[PDB]
Amino acid sequence: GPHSLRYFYTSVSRPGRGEPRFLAVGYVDDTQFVRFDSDAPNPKAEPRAPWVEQEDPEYFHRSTRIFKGAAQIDRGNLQTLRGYYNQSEDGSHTIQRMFGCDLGPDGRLLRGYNQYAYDGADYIALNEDLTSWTAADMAAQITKRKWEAAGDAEHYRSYLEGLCVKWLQIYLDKGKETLQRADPPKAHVTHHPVSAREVTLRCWALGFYPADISLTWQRDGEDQTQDMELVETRPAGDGTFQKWAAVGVPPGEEQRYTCHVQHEGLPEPLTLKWE
Amino acid sequence: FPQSAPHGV
Amino acid sequence: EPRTPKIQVYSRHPAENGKPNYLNCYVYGFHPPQIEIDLLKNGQKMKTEQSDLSFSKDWSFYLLVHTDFTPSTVDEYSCRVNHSSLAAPHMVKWDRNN
Known part of the structure; x- marks a missing residue:
């Protein structure tokens, strides 16, 4: 490459x-x-x-x-x-x-x-x-x-x-x-209650090398980039890299939201959700 | 493998 | 003139009260490179290792400061950062969700 x-x-x-x-x-x-x-x-x-x-x-x-x-x-x-x-x-x-x-x-x-x-x-x-x-x-x-x-x-x-x-x-x-042995991210969503009105859904990517990655949220096929929280990629300290993207969604509504992960370490892009 | 500039600024 | 550092304070792995882990303070986007970065346990400076100074395409510096730590319900961890770009030292609390 x-x-x-x-x-x-x-x-x-x-x-x-x-x-x-x-x-x-x-x-x-x-x-x-x-x-x-x-x-x-x-x-x-x-x-x-x-x-x-x-x-x-x-x-x-x-x-x-x-x-x-x-x-x-x-x-x-x-x-x-x-x-x-x-x-x-x-x-x-x-x-x-x-x-x-x-x-x-x-x-x-x-x-x-x-x-x-x-x-x-x-x-x-x-x-x-x-x-x-x-x-x-x-x-x-x-x-x-x-x-x-x-x-x-x-x-x-x-x-x-x-x-x-x-x-x-x-x-x-x-x-x-x-x-040249590119590390894939191990991806998982966490669930942070804020209020009756919103839960924070956070899509974690961990153990990826190299640093470059697209971490994105979709509600009902529809990209939330403009409406999502997203830290700058960060070093784990063991030669791998970390990133999360979060979205404040109405509780009950979690399954409307799919997190997506693109990394050259991935044979196919991962789509995951809460659980 | 590194390199220094032949000349200064 | 000076650019002001971004700071994240995060553990290498998801945190289990009792399980040794590594505490990281990633500070980036700053200039000039003279910076003070400390990890604090209950506002007390810990023994840390700091990475080799490097910069990005925009010439701003970045540094990983880190240490071994074992999280507990009892202990508060934070990262202190003085740079020329700041009126006074900023301290960023470690939250296990960040």
Whole structure:
């Protein structure tokens, strides 16, 4: 199916409190597999899933090498950006980088990503041509002129069309019974009396991986999306995900309502009701 | 597998 | 400037007074990343584990803070969260139905 490899770089300046701290994490889909913290003593790159632990120690040395690179480059970015926006040396600021690749079902590069934010907002991002940048404003524009002059995109390309797809296929293969063994939700409705006028019917989905799921209520074939309560999908803490959708119905009327669950983990969509 | 940017901002 | 965190406080499995379980505080949609997240048993800070900081497509941060716990009729559990986006720390009660 469609799989993704993404890294998430976060560097935060700590005015007064020494040099900026850098944090990196690596994900395949909704599974984290590495981390790095510049503040950890003798700071290495640490495995965070079982299927990476089975790589030669060089795999981790190389990554370590690269995160230290990333940490130091950011230390400089943070200070040049203060310059750019003409900000004092007083406040904490944040630089974020998300990059990686998507593969299509046939296992070839679909899409590549290289985007930056400053203080939570769009700074610069590599367009889909993999050659030009979208800068968010006049500051990022300076970076566009520089990186386009230097021809930096070409080096991200190298990595995209080289290492990125390569290591994704390697992870997908080395973690099949996790990353391609998709967990179906175990679904159940609960019954929460509120008043004489309404019972809350809550459709629970638990133990699903990956996170993506459609949780929907119908009264008499008729979708209640606009009229239903629905939490943002949440991590169980064991690598699986949770979600519920609730509806306030007149008591007696429960059997008018059917909850529906769509997940790639499901051979066929589940329709269930109260009991 | 990660990558650092050749240049700063 | 700052974005304000969403907070859910929930157990890993449906709660049985007496049966050990895991208590989770999922806080997401916030910026900047400096945040204080604590699980409280009767308003008292517990020993917790906090996840590795990450962010979503919109650049907002998210964190799972968690611990072992055994629910009872006696004990009140809650999650305390201070962020720059808040006037003061918010505490969200654990309800077994949430």
